[PDB]
Structure formats: C-alpha cells, structure tokens
Amino acid sequence: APSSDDLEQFAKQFKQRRIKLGFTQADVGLALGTLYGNVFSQTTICRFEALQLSFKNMCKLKPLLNKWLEETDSIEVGVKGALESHFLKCPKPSAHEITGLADSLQLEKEVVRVWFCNRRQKEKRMTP
DNA sequence: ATGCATGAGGA
DNA sequence: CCTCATGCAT
C-alpha cells in the first residue's frame, strides 16, 4: 500500500497530465465509465486531485485513474460558526444533543445530524 | 470547488 | 444511529 506521499505525488501528476491532454474532470469521470464500467462524477475526480477523500478511498481510486492515464498517453454564517464551535467540543453528539442544538439553533434535527456526519467525514480526508 | 445529501452496510 | 463512498445542485 502507498504512503500519503505516494498518493500526493500521483494526484499532482495525474492532474498535470489530464490538463495537458485537455480533458476536464467530468471527462475523466465519464471515461472511467466508458472504458472500465466504473463511472465517476466531476466531484469525485476533483476531490481526488485535491486529496479531499479518505486514505482508503484514495487508494481504491488510484489504480483506476492509473489505468486511464496509461491508456490515453442553506445554513447561515451565524449558524455555521456555532455548529463548528460545538464540534470542537463534542464531535459525536447524542440524538439528544443533536435535537437539542437543532431547535435551539433553529434547524431541523436531520439537517443538524447530517452536518455533523459530514464534518466528521471531512476530518478523515487526507487533507481536510 | 464545495455544501448538503443519499443509501448501503454495519455494530 | 453510525461510517463510508459518492454526487446533485450550487
């Protein structure tokens, strides 16, 4: 398995080469469908180039992007800041903390619950 | 490039 | 409920 440094260098050189070939991020994502039956979105290609995915996600995707390379050659600021503050304190809130913070902050419980799942996921990105 | 979301899968 | 991989919509 690759180091974080391996994946960083791979990402850099993947991006350089995609741009040089004049393909867009969506182009690559689509071609992974066309060529390998594994379609991906522009969002996914973008995150991969920015290392904004988990280490394991990055590792699963790298060989796929490598094959492609080989071949071709809302919530408001008042609310947000507060949400962030609590996260630094309690990153994993109980369904009561959640429902509690939700109404007090005037948001649906489900919007608050998902915000915390996403915030937790971000921290697990190779570069958050 | 990013914010909020879905849904499969698991303790 | 969560983690996780993933993307629609912005």
Curated annotation (Swiss-Prot):
Position of the signal peptide: none
Subcellular location: Nucleus
Ranges of residues in domain POU-specific: 1-73
Segments of the chain annotated as binding DNA: 74-127
Family: Belongs to the POU transcription factor family. Class-3 subfamily.
Task of the protein: Transcription factor that binds to the octamer motif (5'-ATTTGCAT-3'). Acts as a transcriptional activator when binding cooperatively with SOX4, SOX11, or SOX12 to gene promoters. Acts as a transcriptional repressor of myelin-specific genes.
Protein name, as recorded: POU domain, class 3, transcription factor 1
Organism from which the protein derives: Mus musculus
Name of the encoding gene: Pou3f1
